[PDB]
């Protein structure tokens, strides 16, 4: 059992896979706090979790070569904090499966969580390694984790050089999560946090940072996490025909009430989350009780972030009167700062991996007598 | 097609709209809120001012000679493009545009960035600053057309904001802002202020009617008795968009093969990564061929023209639908009612075109 050393996890989590460990918090706990407690933050591991002795750990940065200890990472670079939501490419995959079977972890609406991350700015570490603030043409910063497949290939990913060097992009080499040291499942001792970008690129248990003229050659950068036409099937898919998912599109889901519930008549408070990639804020959330025919505007909770740096989700709520003995089909949809919107239905956005599941979330409940 | 004479507003015929990557100056859609100014070029001056910047008064000759000419091929799409689709759901207030309030040109001019830096403004300002524009066109009272963009976009080298005096290789036409306009790539046409008289750096958004009390998106539930422009942000970047230009609604096409064509575009420099095309009303899809050359990442200011040749069977009915996907994997929604708004702006639900196949 290569997973014999994996860490202990909270019992309240909805485990989608044990070995490797993948789990999401239940819907009723998911949006209870703006910052998702470390114990409930969703967990996505492709491989066994590395057991890292903090003292001997070294971060390799291949400059135009650094070997940074955890103590150096902490002391040499000013600590910055960024509150960012990580959403998995597979969040809401369960919706896709309802149309046609897909390949992937059966996530519901909880493959998304939010934390206040603390660490060194990737920008500062790269400038310290001797790299220039700017590089002409399309360059990339590649990441490798300490976790590896049977063949010894590590988990890896990349982001464009521009994003890595940009102060406003808030890309961190994080060693703290919600004020405490990074948990093992979340990348102890160091992970990359890439705000506004799909979770896949936020490499945990970071071993190496390199600059390259090309994207990471990792399996998960080249041959996974892309969107295709709904017509594409396993016999025709060609990962060269689409871009790696970086920024994600606008998203929202209803966390309260839950599907199949019978709610009391009178007033009903509907709640959920909304978020969009690339630091685009959520400017509105529309909520319907009649299956998307008529809408009401939800209250957006929380504090406004600077323009282009809305890395954290918006929690929303709406209290509405409901009549005894009626059926409700509760639907939410969000609008971001570029006026991007969510689509009505899943079949037209369907894909063989069930990624990029952003059609409206629909929750059916009945109202008691 | 002219939607209005006084003031003048017009769009090119759908049959020519997407026939050339660069829209000829004579066909490029025209949206004018006010009478078109008659600008005498020698006496014209562009005023540039603001806190911590030297006030400039630039002649057309100096704008051309002092600043290095930059060329940017950028698509301008009006907020009301495809308004007709909104009116079919419920009547709205606005020009009755069809799919042609969008056009593309190669613009040439001074970088707004260079002009502001020349005036002494810094590359970055803390807080949320804006760059305000005022046109020479004005209402009978005298308020000019105006707009603004965030200071960060104005100063970004990558954002390609121009003070353009050339359009597709020739002098800027009168209807398109002669002698000078702002071109704001990847942003709604409303902010590309024509007949530019002033550029001002300000800590606040432009107080213009068209910045404060127009060009915003609202929930479909909002009506005239409840609309409050303070509740929404000014449209700046636009969402992913596409439409079919060939064939045209109600066409009877010959059997055999059919070449479906159209355009696709997305705001904020996000490239179009795919266009899906259906012939059965959105039940099944095929992938269209994207025409033209790639642009650098984050600077896809120009539309992608697309086409798909498909076999069609005699005597059948088709419902042709297209939808586009951008670099952040944003998508177009299925239907118009849920994106409906009282001004019929931001019309990006799937375009559907019904045709029959002879015989
Ligand atoms: N090294 C390493 N990094 C990783 C992964 C991985 O398996 N190994 N999974 C990725 C995926 S696909 C996502 S969604 C996020 C999940 O971060 P979390 O488990 O801390 O929520 O981590 C990313 N980083
Ligand atoms: N001075 C001024 N500039 C303006 C206009 C206006 O009425 N006056 N209309 C705006 C609108 S709403 C749009 S859609 C574009 C259209 O530019 P075009 O006419 O060159 O296509 O110009 C913008 N610039
Ligand atoms: Mo993921
Ligand atoms: Mo417009």
């Amino acid at each position: 059992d290569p997973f014999a050393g994996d860490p202990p996890r909270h019992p309240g989590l909805r485990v989608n896979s044990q070995k490797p460990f993948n789990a999401e918090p239940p819907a009723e706990l998911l949006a209870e706090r703006f910052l998702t407690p470390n114990e409930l933050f969703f967990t996505r591991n492709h491989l066994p979790v590395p057991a890292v002795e903090p003292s001997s750990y070294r971060l390799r940065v291949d400059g135009p070569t650094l070997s940074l200890s955890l103590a150096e990472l902490r002391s040499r670079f000013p600590k910055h904090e960024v509150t960012a939501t990580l959403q998995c490419a597979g969040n809401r995959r369960s919706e896709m499966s309802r149309v046609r079977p897909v390949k992937g972890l059966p996530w519901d609406i909880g493959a998304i969580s939010t934390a206040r991350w603390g660490g060194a700015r990737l920008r500062d570490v790269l400038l310290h390694a001797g790299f220039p603030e700017e590089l002409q043409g399309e360059w990339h910063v590649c990441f490798e984790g300490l976790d590896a497949d049977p063949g010894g290939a590590p988990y890896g990913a990349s982001i464009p050089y521009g994003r890595a060097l940009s102060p406003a992009a808030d890309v961190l080499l994080a060693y703290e999560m919600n004020g405490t040291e990074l948990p093992r499942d979340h990348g102890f001792p160091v992970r990359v946090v890439v705000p506004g970008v799909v979770g896949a690129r936020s490499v945990k248990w970071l071993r190496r940072v390199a600059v390259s003229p090309d994207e990471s050659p990792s399996h998960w950068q080249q041959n996974d996490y892309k969107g295709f036409s709904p017509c594409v099937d396993w016999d025709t898919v060609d990962y060269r025909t689409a871009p790696a998912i970086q920024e994600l599109p606008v998203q929202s889901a209803v966390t309260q009430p839950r599907p199949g519930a019978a709610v009391p008549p009178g007033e009903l408070t509907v709640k959920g989350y909304a978020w969009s990639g690339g630091g685009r804020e959520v400017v509105r959330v529309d909520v319907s009780l009649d299956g998307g025919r008529t809408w009401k505007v939800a209250r957006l909770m929380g504090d406004k972030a600077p323009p282009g740096r809305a890395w954290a989700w918006a929690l929303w709520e709406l209290t509405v009167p409901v009549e005894a003995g009626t059926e409700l089909e509760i639907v939410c949809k969000a609008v971001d700062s570029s006026y991007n919107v969510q689509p009505d239905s899943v079949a037209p956005i369907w894909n063989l991996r069930g990624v990029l599941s952003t059609a409206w979330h629909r929750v059916r409940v009945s109202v008691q007598d």
Side-chain angles (χ1 to χ4, degrees), chain A:
Chain A
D1 185 16
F3 306 88
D6 276 25
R9 300 98 179 200
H10 202 81
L13 282 275
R14 322 322 290 154
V15 183
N16 295 321
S17 182
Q18 271 292 345
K19 297 173 192 174
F21 189 76
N22 296 280
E24 66 189 277
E28 32 285 293
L29 295 183
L30 208 216
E32 294 309 301
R33 290 298 203 112
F34 172 71
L35 299 183
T36 313
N38 288 4
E39 302 95 327
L40 301 177
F41 197 109
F42 86 102
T43 298
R44 203 281 180 257
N45 303 334
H46 289 83
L47 298 162
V49 175
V52 187
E53 196 285 305
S55 73
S56 63
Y57 167 90
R58 294 295 184 282
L59 176 55
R60 175 173 151 101
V61 185
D62 298 331
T65 296
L66 306 177
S67 178
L68 300 172
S69 66
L70 186 54
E72 292 176 68
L73 190 63
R74 289 180 165 271
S75 62
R76 178 175 294 282
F77 309 97
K79 189 173 76 185
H80 288 256
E81 299 188 336
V82 180
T83 299
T85 295
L86 297 182
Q87 186 184 5
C88 190
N91 190 34
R92 304 185 57 212
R93 173 169 291 105
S94 70
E95 301 270 11
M96 298 272 167
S97 294
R98 293 180 54 122
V99 179
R100 202 195 339 283
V102 297
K103 176 192 290 187
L105 289 168
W107 300 110
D108 193 50
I109 68 171
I112 185 166
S113 295
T114 304
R116 179 171 44 84
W117 309 93
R121 295 193 305 178
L122 177 53
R123 169 187 167 83
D124 295 337
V125 175
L126 290 176
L127 289 180
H128 178 67
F131 290 104
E133 198 182 33
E134 196 167 333
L135 286 170
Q136 187 262 285
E138 295 174 17
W139 288 83
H140 301 268
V141 178
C142 301
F143 308 123
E144 281 176 9
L146 285 163
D147 55 324
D149 75 9
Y155 183 82
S158 60
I159 61 171
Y161 192 87
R163 187 182 295 280
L165 273 289
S166 171
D170 284 322
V171 180
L172 297 184
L173 299 186
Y175 45 73
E176 293 182 348
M177 179 187 181
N178 286 334
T180 57
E181 79 175 29
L182 261 186
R184 286 190 63 202
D185 273 331
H186 302 290
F188 179 80
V190 177
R191 80 175 296 160
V192 188
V193 174
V194 187
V197 169
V198 69
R201 311 307 170 207
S202 286
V203 177
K204 293 186 281 183
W205 312 288
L206 193 63
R207 166 215 300 186
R208 184 189 170 202
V209 175
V211 172
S212 167
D214 310 306
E215 277 188 306
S216 165
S218 181
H219 169 82
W220 297 277
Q221 190 72 36
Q222 298 298 134
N223 296 299
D224 202 342
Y225 302 120
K226 300 192 176 188
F228 303 95
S229 184
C231 60
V232 167
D233 198 356
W234 299 99
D235 61 345
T236 61
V237 67
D238 178 352
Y239 273 77
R240 297 171 295 175
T241 69
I245 295 163
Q246 288 289 169
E247 293 181 1
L248 286 169
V250 57
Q251 176 69 102
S252 66
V254 182
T255 55
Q256 170 184 128
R258 299 290 293 146
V263 303
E267 290 207 287
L268 172 64
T269 297
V270 183
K271 307 187 165 184
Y273 62 85
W275 178 90
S276 199
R280 294 181 289 273
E281 67 166 352
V282 173
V283 307
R284 203 181 70 251
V285 174
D286 292 328
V287 177
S288 173
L289 304 181
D290 61 14
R293 194 170 313 272
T294 66
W295 304 88
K296 286 177 181 302
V297 182
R299 180 178 160 188
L300 303 177
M301 308 301 297
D303 308 337
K304 293 176 182 179
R309 307 173 78 195
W311 308 127
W313 56 14
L315 298 189
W316 60 261
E317 68 180 27
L318 178 62
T319 300
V320 109
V322 296
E323 298 181 53
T326 57
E327 309 300 330
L328 308 183
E329 180 179 356
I330 303 170
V331 185
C332 70
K333 61 183 178 79
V335 184
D336 75 13
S337 61
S338 62
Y339 283 99
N340 272 297
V341 298
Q342 296 177 253
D344 308 37
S345 73
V346 175
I349 59 159
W350 186 92
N351 62 91
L352 74 183
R353 277 276 287 110
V355 292
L356 297 167
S357 184
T358 68
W360 311 332
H361 188 216
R362 303 175 184 261
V363 170
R364 293 178 184 275
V365 306
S366 62
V367 188
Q368 296 179 135
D369 299 327

